[PDB]
């Protein structure tokens, strides 16, 4: 019965990302995963 | 609701935002679907 939207507008629109040797991950849980909001942002060279 | 797009009943037709400012992903792409039917039917 979870209804809170997922904070997906926090990683794709980031200003500066982490380095290669210090890659950071974000814990995502207790939300509704709506992946339809990702296609309208920008296409991706690799979507495997 | 029959002819009022104001309330929750929205129009099912939406327009694109094709502009040269938008990069790849939002650009228009022409698609040609060459439907082929190869079977025992007489070929013309």
């Amino acid at each position, epitope marked *: 019965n979870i209804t809170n939207l997922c904070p997906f507008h926090e990683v794709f629109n*980031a*200003t500066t*990302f*982490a380095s290669v040797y210090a890659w*950071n991950r974000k814990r995502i849980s207790n939300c509704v995963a709506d992946y339809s909001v990702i296609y309208n942002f920008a296409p991706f060279f690799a979507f495997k | 609701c029959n002819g009022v797009a104001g309330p929750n009943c929205y129009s099912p037709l939406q327009s694109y935002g094709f502009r040269p*400012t938008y990069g790849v992903g939002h650009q228009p792409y022409r698609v040609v679907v060459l439907s082929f039917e190869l079977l025992h039917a007489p070929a013309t």
Partner: antibody, heavy 117, light 109 residues
Framework: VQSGAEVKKPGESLKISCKGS????????IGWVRQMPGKGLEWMGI????????RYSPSFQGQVTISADKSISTAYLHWSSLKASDTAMYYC??????????????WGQGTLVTVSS | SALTQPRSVSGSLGQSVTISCTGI?????????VSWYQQHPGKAPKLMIY???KRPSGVPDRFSGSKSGNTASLTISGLQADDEADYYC?????????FGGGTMLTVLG
């Protein structure tokens, strides 16, 4: 140096400009930030010298468009169906090699558009 | 979120002043997306403090910042007569530019 602000009525599609120097208009982001009398700065959007991947503010998605000129390195703005609350001091800012792409390294002069009838 | 800033401050010549800045958000990639701008009354704004972990070029060393959670502070020393100007903190962690409520620096003497 910037162009003057002529008194216009809401709905005449006025235009503002700003002149910058000291860089190459090739790969440096550039945008416009307004300032209404009595409030702080308000960022609207930016434009890229190449592919114009313009990213407008959520409060400025359909209120103002960027029409900067690349051949003369002079920025321009276009409006349509203006309002009385559009009077603000528009400042032209660029990316600059100081910070990131969204960081504003330099600023323009600023012109206060006056709207009256 | 909206950045909260004091409307008016009261400094002094030779003393220091700390301008508060709350409501700063953060995204994946860092939390130092804090920058300050110096705008003189009726003049053109100039970049003064950005990336408080570093020091900008041309800006005097009497300007510095700090970070403490979601609240930032702008430490300014050596207040003079020409230092009277507007200051605004900016946050660009989510690729969106936001400004504070406006700060007016006043000095006594």
């Amino acid at each position: 140096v910037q162009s003057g602000a002529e008194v216009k009525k809401p709905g005449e599609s006025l235009k503002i400009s700003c002149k910058g120097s000291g860089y190459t208009f090739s790969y440096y982001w550039i945008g416009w930030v307004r300032q209404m009398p009595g409030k702080g700065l308000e960022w609207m959007g930016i434009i890229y010298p190449g592919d114009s991947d313009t990213r407008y503010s959520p409060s400025f998605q359909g209120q103002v468009t960027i029409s900067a000129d690349k051949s003369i390195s002079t920025a321009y703005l276009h409006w349509s169906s203006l309002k009385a609350s559009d009077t603000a001091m528009y400042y032209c800012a660029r990316q600059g090699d100081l910070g990131d792409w969204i960081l504003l390294g330099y600023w323009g002069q600023g012109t206060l558009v006056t709207v009256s009838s | 979120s909206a950045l909260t800033q004091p409307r008016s401050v009261s400094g002094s010549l030779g003393q220091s002043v700390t301008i508060s800045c709350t409501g700063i958000s953060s995204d994946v990639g860092g939390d130092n997306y804090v920058s300050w701008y110096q705008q003189h009354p009726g003049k053109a704004p100039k970049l003064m403090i950005y990336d408080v972990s570093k020091r900008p070029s041309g800006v005097p060393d009497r300007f510095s910042g700090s970070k403490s959670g979601n609240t930032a502070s702008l430490t300014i020393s050596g207040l003079q007569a020409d230092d009277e100007a507007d200051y605004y903190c900016c946050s660009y962690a989510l690729s969106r530019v936001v400004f504070g409520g406006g700060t007016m620096l006043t000095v006594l003497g």
